Design a protein around this nucleic acid. Structure first.
Ligand SMILES: [Ca+2]
Ligand SMILES: [Ca+2]
Ligand code: NA
Lengths: 249, 246
DNA sequence: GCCGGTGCACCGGC
DNA sequence: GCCGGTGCACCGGC
């Protein structure tokens, strides 16, 4: 992690910060995070969309999607970070990618052909804990599937940054942060909430970090968990959404 | 319905309406209604606030809940046990992401729940989440259990807008009623928080049959659809990944 | 045309 | 403590 070694810097400058008072979060702190990481690690840090523009700017020779897709040099990273075929082809120097809500990552750090996908989960601390959607389980499955096919086991990490806040009035105030790597958690202990867009849910400060095996072992362990859980859900649908209503019909 | 009678008016006013750089067209819809039907028009939180101030004696959740005198409307409209419990005049209800409705219109003990759908028509059509299919099945169930078949309607107002400048402008609107649609035609997208999806303008409004019949039809449709999904998952999320784990 | 997966967190039952 | 359903709509493959 390019971040972990400065968690303390990060945490020191956030606690406070004070932002000013639908499907937006409630916290602009993510912006505050980026600003910092961009500030201090300026060579390594980008919004997902910014990284793609820069990727494309640096290769004007390459027009059209199939070719701009070869600019990733990685089926798995292609999968996580790229926009659709049409948008990529229409990519133009004077027509750049903007923020898409659907983008896999919030911030993204890259040094030496290795990627840290960083997702910030903000969280109102005054309220009753509700584990937020972390990332599609189904996306992660394909992601894992893709690592194994392409033996890309030493390419990227997907990490999370929890920033907690409350309302002293007028302004929101950050009161604490947490940082966790996903590929250091025990895969079989990941909560897949199917109904909630098939998302993994957890709080970052609650997240297991004692996986000891290899990345590859992680990916295979995750697929086993995923497949196990999909079978659970299917079975669980009958008693949950079928049995209780048959009386009426 | 309460707004259909003057829907044309609502439609002519909304077009041309501009909002600065489109979820807040919902506000305009609300302003217009409050101004044209002020005694009928409430935000969900507003209606609950108005009910509970009228009965300042009736404190606590159990007692407040009895205030609805309808197990169905209790279900679509109320807040949690602690929430109602800690309700105060100095601590009133506020907006809540997953409250059922955007706007409530009511008169003579009859309820029209109105969910406004904003749509960026600039961008290629993506059928929006309408309501939870599961919350709908429960609704139908209770509708049946307590024989509440003439109490409330769940209607939608599509508000189409585009990025016409430094801000957004409404270009058109549509108005459909859930209970007029064909139950077995409704698209349940299970992954998407199990949400029924559609474009108001695309919804059929021809259902021949009583409200009770609708509820039963939907329940047939839901139960059925659930079963299909059970199996769809093994093909989608189990078969395609078994290779990596043998 | 047809189809359905994803980002944002977020509440309340027992 | 455990657990999981709900609202916002919103793209891109073929
Ligand atoms: Ca985020
Ligand atoms: Ca709405
Ligand atoms: Na809705």
């Amino acid at each position: 992690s390019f971040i972990k070694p400065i968690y303390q810097d990060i945490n020191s400058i956030l606690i406070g910060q004070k932002v000013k008072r639908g499907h937006a979060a409630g916290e602009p702190f993510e912006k505050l995070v980026y600003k910092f990481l961009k500030e201090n690690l300026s060579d390594l840090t980008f919004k997902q969309y910014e990284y793609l523009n820069d990727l494309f700017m640096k290769n004007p020779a390459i027009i059209g999607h199939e070719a701009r897709y070869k600019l990733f040099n990685s089926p798995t990273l292609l999968f996580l970070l790229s926009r659709g075929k049409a948008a990529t082809e229409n990519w133009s120097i004077e027509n750049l990618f903007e923020e898409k809500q659907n983008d896999t990552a919030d911030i993204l750090l890259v040094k030496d052909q290795f990627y840290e996908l960083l997702d910030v989960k903000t969280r109102n601390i005054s309220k009753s804990a509700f584990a937020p959607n972390i990332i599609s389980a189904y996306k992660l499955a394909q992601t894992c599937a893709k690592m194994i096919d392409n033996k890309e086991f030493d390419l990227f990490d997907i990490n999370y940054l929890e920033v907690d806040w409350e309302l002293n009035g007028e302004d929101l105030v950050c009161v604490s942060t947490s940082f966790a790597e996903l590929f250091k958690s025990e895969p079989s202990e990941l909560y897949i909430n199917w109904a909630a867009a098939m998302q993994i849910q957890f709080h970052v400060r609650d997240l297991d970090q004692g996986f000891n095996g290899t990345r590859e072992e992680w990916a295979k362990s995750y697929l086993k968990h995923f497949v196990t859980q999909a079978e659970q859900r299917a079975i669980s649908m009958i008693d949950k959404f079928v049995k209780p209503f048959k009386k009426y019909i």
